[PDB]
Amino acid sequence: MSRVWLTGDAVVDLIPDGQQHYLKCPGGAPANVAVAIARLSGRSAFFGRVGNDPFGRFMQQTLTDEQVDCQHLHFDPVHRTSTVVVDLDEHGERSFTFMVKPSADQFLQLSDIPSFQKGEWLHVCSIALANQPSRSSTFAAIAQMKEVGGYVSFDPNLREEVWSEPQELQATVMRAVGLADVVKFSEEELQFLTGTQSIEEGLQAIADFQIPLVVVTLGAKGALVATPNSQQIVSGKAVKPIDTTGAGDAFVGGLLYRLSVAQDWHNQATILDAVKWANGCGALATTQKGAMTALPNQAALYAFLE
Amino acid sequence: MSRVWLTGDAVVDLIPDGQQHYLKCPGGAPANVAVAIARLSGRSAFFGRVGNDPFGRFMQQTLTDEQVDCQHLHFDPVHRTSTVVVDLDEHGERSFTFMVKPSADQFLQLSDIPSFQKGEWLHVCSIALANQPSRSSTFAAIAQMKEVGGYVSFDPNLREEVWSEPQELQATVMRAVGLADVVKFSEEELQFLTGTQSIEEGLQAIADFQIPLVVVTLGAKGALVATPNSQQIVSGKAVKPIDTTGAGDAFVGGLLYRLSVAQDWHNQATILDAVKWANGCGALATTQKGAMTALPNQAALYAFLE
Ligand SMILES: Nc1ncnc2c1ncn2[C@@H]1O[C@H](COP(=O)(O)OP(=O)(O)O)[C@@H](O)[C@H]1O
Ligand SMILES: Nc1ncnc2c1ncn2[C@@H]1O[C@H](COP(=O)(O)OP(=O)(O)O)[C@@H](O)[C@H]1O
Ligand SMILES: OC[C@H]1O[C@](O)(CO)[C@@H](O)[C@@H]1O
Ligand SMILES: OC[C@H]1O[C@](O)(CO)[C@@H](O)[C@@H]1O
Ligand code: BEF
Ligand code: BEF
Numbered sequence: 001m002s003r004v005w006l007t008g009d010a011v012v013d014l015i016p017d018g019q020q021h022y023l024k025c026p027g028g029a030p031a032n033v034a035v036a037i038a039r040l041s042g043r044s045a046f047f048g049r050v051g052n053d054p055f056g057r058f059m060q061q062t063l064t065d066e067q068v069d070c071q072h073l074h075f076d077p078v079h080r081t082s083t084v085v086v087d088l089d090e091h092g093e094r095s096f097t098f099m100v101k102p103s104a105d106q107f108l109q110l111s112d113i114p115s116f117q118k119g120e121w122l123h124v125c126s127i128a129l130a131n132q133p134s135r136s137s138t139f140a141a142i143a144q145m146k147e148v149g150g151y152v153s154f155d156p157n158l159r160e161e162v163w164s165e166p167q168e169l170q171a172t173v174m175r176a177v178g179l180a181d182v183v184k185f186s187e188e189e190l191q192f193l194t195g196t197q198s199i200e201e202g203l204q205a206i207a208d209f210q211i212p213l214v215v216v217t218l219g220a221k222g223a224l225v226a227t228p229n230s231q232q233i234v235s236g237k238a239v240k241p242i243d244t245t246g247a248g249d250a251f252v253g254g255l256l257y258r259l260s261v262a263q264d265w266h267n268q269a270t271i272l273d274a275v276k277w278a279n280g281c282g283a284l285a286t287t288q289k290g291a292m293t294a295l296p297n298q299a300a301l302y303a304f305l306e
Numbered sequence: 307m308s309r310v311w312l313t314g315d316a317v318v319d320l321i322p323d324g325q326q327h328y329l330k331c332p333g334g335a336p337a338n339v340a341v342a343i344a345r346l347s348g349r350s351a352f353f354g355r356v357g358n359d360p361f362g363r364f365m366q367q368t369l370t371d372e373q374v375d376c377q378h379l380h381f382d383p384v385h386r387t388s389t390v391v392v393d394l395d396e397h398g399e400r401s402f403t404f405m406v407k408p409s410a411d412q413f414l415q416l417s418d419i420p421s422f423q424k425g426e427w428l429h430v431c432s433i434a435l436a437n438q439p440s441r442s443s444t445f446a447a448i449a450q451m452k453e454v455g456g457y458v459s460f461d462p463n464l465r466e467e468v469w470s471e472p473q474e475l476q477a478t479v480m481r482a483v484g485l486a487d488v489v490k491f492s493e494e495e496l497q498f499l500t501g502t503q504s505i506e507e508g509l510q511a512i513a514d515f516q517i518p519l520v521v522v523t524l525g526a527k528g529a530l531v532a533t534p535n536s537q538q539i540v541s542g543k544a545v546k547p548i549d550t551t552g553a554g555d556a557f558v559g560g561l562l563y564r565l566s567v568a569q570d571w572h573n574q575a576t577i578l579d580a581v582k583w584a585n586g587c588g589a590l591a592t593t594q595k596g597a598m599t600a601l602p603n604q605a606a607l608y609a610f611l612e
């Protein structure tokens with residue numbers, strides 16, 4: 001069972017629950033992925049910075065509770081933990097307002113990067129690339145994982161408002177796309193990043209990247225899986241979402257859990273099965289408010305997939 | 307009825323209400339004072355900056371609902387509205403964690419200051435002095451109110467963590483104390499700012515400021531009122547607080563409401579009556595969670611004072 005490293009932003013998502021209240025929900029895409037993997041009995045570890053504040057300590061506690069290795073989660077001395085307000089009438093990027101800019105995670109330093117080993121995974125989202133020093137630190141982490149013979153997963157997970165220089169987003173994100181073994185886009189993100197109007201055109205636009213595995217999520221319709229000379233839609237049972245927050249991260253968690261335990265993750269059968277798990281995780285994640293709340297264990301996932 | 311201008315930070319206070327929820331409560335000391343005055347049928351107006359975000363719009367809506375003039379509440383183009391997490395096991399400064407530093411209000415500019423007129427009041431708290439440009443803008447506003455023949459009220463309302471240079475707090479706050487007609491301290495703040503161990507010693511330490519009216523709040527014991535050659539404790543009925551958040555601002559609101567409608571606020575009878583109102587407001591404010599929730603109207607206050 002290969003270790004999956006997650007890095008980036010652990011955040012508190014404030015999610016409406018009644019007209020005058022927010023639920024205090026643990027979140028942050030790479031933290032969500034870490035917990036998704038752990039819930040499936042995988043080996044996940046998180047490195048990054050939160051703030052020395054109650055929200056940062058709450059995220060440390062959450063990762064601890066969830067059996068995610070968080071020895072390399074540090075408290076920044078000055079900056080605050082990311083705090084995000086969710087609007088449930090919107091979906092994805094449009095649903096979030098980032099109250100802390102730049103939050104502690106944006107100050108990831110080179111010395112925060114842990115030792116990597118051959119065969120490990122590193123998963124990254126674009127918020128880690130939004131501002132310096134995290135951007136350069138995260139690119140260094142990617143280069144180090146590649147050098148040691150590990151694998152790199154990237155989910156742009158675009159949140160434009162976090163970028164102090166939003167005009168840098170497209171190029172910076174595409175630089176990371178070019179480094180990854182696995183890239184997951186939503187349909188909308190693929191089109192945005194490539195300036196195209198369809199998935200077909202978006203996939204053609206990234207062909208010269210020779211990305212080993214691209215997955216494009218299609219909401220209730222599942223996911224398009226693109227590997228060399230092959231495209232295939234993989235879909236499971238559609239559900240009516242209660243909260244879509246983090247469904248994409250649950251998806252990545254199932255995907256990477258299955259790739260991480262595979263003898264040879266490049267194998268087409270392994271990939272398609274991993275995407276079946278991913279779709280089931282994404283569906284189940286939507287059944288409760290909070291990105292992490294309904295991240296399934298294997299008993300729940302197997303029951304749903306049957 | 308003289309207009310009272312309030313400036314500084316309008317904030318969203320996230321107040322625990324159940325183990326997994328926060329109440330979304332409008333707050334921010336000068337906003338609290340503005341609303342307290344308005345609830346008592348006074349003429350209050352707020353100038354300052356919040357963020358172009360849901361919390362900033364919520365604070366605009368709150369001031370609007372409360373009949374506080376907020377024509378001069380602006381949305382900063384870049385910075386976020388102050389967001390504060392409250393710990394109900396603590397009191398005052400120790401109960402707050404500021405998640406947004408620097409928030410929008412810290413970017414108050416000289417051009418944000420509205421036109422003042424003779425006999426108006428301006429009330430300020432120390433967060434407005436914490437960082438530039440708000441610090442210099444607020445000192446300019448104070449100088450302008452003094453020049454036109456208005457009156458200046460200052461409540462340090464210390465929140466050290468908001469200062470990027472906390473070593474500047476003492477001197478900067480005492481500079482404002484030297485400009486004010488009315489200064490309200492908690493017992494703890496007076497001692498901290500003067501480096502003393504008693505109210506008596508603290509009052510002696512500020513004697514050469516020749517401050518026309520100093521009020522030192524004493525929690526359930528009421529307030530010490532210090533005017534030239536006179537000190538007097540004014541107390542009302544003690545209550546068991548449900549939430550002390552903003553009790554001090556309710557106090558200031560009652561005080562300034564009564565001074566603002568007085569023919570001659572310097573009159574000793576007027577001052578002592580204003581403090582009686584202040585104590586009643588402070589007590590009643592504690593009866594519900596949220597700084598603004600239980601700010602009384604006159605019917606409630608009169609009933610309580612009887
Ligand atoms: N209505 C749905 N029914 C079943 N699965 C869904 C549904 N919506 C999303 N999913 C699953 O979640 C994945 C990602 O969708 P998405 O909502 O974009 O994630 P997120 O909201 O976290 O950004 C899909 O590929 C799919 O597996
Ligand atoms: N337990 C209490 N009973 C009655 N009045 C109180 C009580 N606590 C506070 N007050 C009133 O509120 C005023 C300020 O107290 P304080 O709690 O320090 O305000 P804040 O919590 O907003 O900083 C007192 O001067 C008094 O008028
Ligand atoms: O993917 C969902 C997650 O992404 C974020 O917007 C940024 O990391 C979080 O607020 C949320 O939990
Ligand atoms: O005085 C109470 C108020 O002071 C603040 O801490 C800062 O303005 C707010 O969080 C609260 O409403
Ligand atoms: F970005 Be998804 F909501 F995880
Ligand atoms: F600072 Be007090 F709680 F208004």
Ligand SMILES: [Ca+2]
Pocket residue numbers: 092157158186248249
């Ligand atoms: Ca996503």
Ligand SMILES: [Ca+2]
Pocket residue numbers: 398463464492554555
């Ligand atoms: Ca106070």
Ligand code: NA
Pocket residue numbers: 243245246285286287288289290291292293294295
């Ligand atoms: Na959920």
Ligand code: NA
Pocket residue numbers: 549551552591592593594595596597598599600601
């Ligand atoms: Na209250």
